[PDB]
RNA sequence: ACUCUGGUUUCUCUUCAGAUCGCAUAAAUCUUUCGCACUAAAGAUUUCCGUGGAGAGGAACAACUCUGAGUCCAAUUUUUUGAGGCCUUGCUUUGGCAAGGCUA
């Protein structure tokens, strides 16, 4: 629903914001590995 | 001994950090090693708990402590005198200079 979609968008934003802590280095190591 | 900065606290955001970033210490994955892997070691990666530095924004009271900067000597030894006057020579830039001999 509208509220549900807004909620999951917010929660996905929260999760990617948290993963932003080491996003660059983690993604670089994963690409290299 | 006179004047001008810088404050401190709190909330949020951005970046860097192999520094005991943390006077503490988890978990997962992959590889290797031997056992035969909670009762086991090594290497690497990741995620978590949560930090310091710098920068930026917000808002609460202290504003010159501190960090800075701009702002009493006459008696030997130094700055309260042994100073000035005469004579010769080389050259006179004819003002006298240089050296020596003097008198005080």
Curated annotation (Swiss-Prot):
Expression tissues: Widely expressed.
Coiled coil (UniProt feature): none
Domain of life: Eukaryota
Post-translational modification: Phosphorylated by PRP4K during spliceosome assembly.
Location(s), subcellular: Nucleus, Nucleoplasm; Nucleus speckle
Disease: Retinitis pigmentosa 60: A retinal dystrophy belonging to the group of pigmentary retinopathies. Retinitis pigmentosa is characterized by retinal pigment deposits visible on fundus examination and primary loss of rod photoreceptor cells followed by secondary loss of cone photoreceptors. Patients typically have night vision blindness and loss of midperipheral visual field. As their condition progresses, they lose their far peripheral visual field and eventually central vision as well.
Assembly mode: Identified in the spliceosome B complex. Identified in the spliceosome C complex. Associates with the U5 snRNP particle. Component of the U4/U6-U5 tri-snRNP complex composed of the U4, U6 and U5 snRNAs and at least PRPF3, PRPF4, PRPF6, PRPF8, PRPF31, SNRNP200, TXNL4A, SNRNP40, DDX23, CD2BP2, PPIH, SNU13, EFTUD2, SART1 and USP39, LSm proteins LSm2-8 and Sm proteins. Interacts with ARAF. Interacts with AR and NR3C1, but not ESR1, independently of the presence of hormones. Interacts with USH1G.
Role played: Involved in pre-mRNA splicing as component of the U4/U6-U5 tri-snRNP complex, one of the building blocks of the spliceosome. Enhances dihydrotestosterone-induced transactivation activity of AR, as well as dexamethasone-induced transactivation activity of NR3C1, but does not affect estrogen-induced transactivation.
UniProt-recorded name of the protein: Pre-mRNA-processing factor 6
UniProt organism field: Homo sapiens (Human)
Lineage, opening ranks: Eukaryota, Metazoa, Chordata, Craniata, Vertebrata
Included stretch of the parent chain: 95 to 127 of 941
